[PDB]
């Protein structure tokens, strides 16, 4: 019906948006990060669906949860976990920031 | 800037609805944003605003964002604080108004 999710915050909050290309083995993954204060969201443009995950607490790196996925970055690397196919969360897909 | 805008394919209908909860004596407004399988929840808590995303669960609708888990079932909800209560055993209970 409409091309957009709009989330309105206090007008004083600066919002940044940046798209980053990742390479997962031979495959490209486009991820967009939306940052507003402590709020951080990642739009993952996956093969069959688009997921919007939220940054959640972790010991290290920046971890995001959305739908059946965990997306977890550290440095120039990232791991994509699929909790349906791999509920053990031990066999993730590795990606490198371009 | 005041607003997060996330672009999606043009035929995706995005619905936005806010729901008032009461957690004991305290008010809590949650706005839900749904678009396809994407479900986000802005929680305007007492001292902070967070955005959680719907994540897989066995029952009800579970959302995770920041240090919180927000889990609705029917007319009720629980708010988990993984800092104050990492054990995840003392959630705050809320009812939809």
From TrEMBL, chain B:
The chain holds residues 27 to 121 of 121 of the full protein. It comes from the Bacteria. Residues 21-87 form the C-type lysozyme inhibitor domain. Disulfide bonds join 23-94. Keywords: Lipoprotein, Membrane, Palmitate, Signal. It comes from Brucella abortus biovar 1 (strain 9-941). Transmembrane segments: none annotated. This is C-type lysozyme inhibitor domain-containing protein.
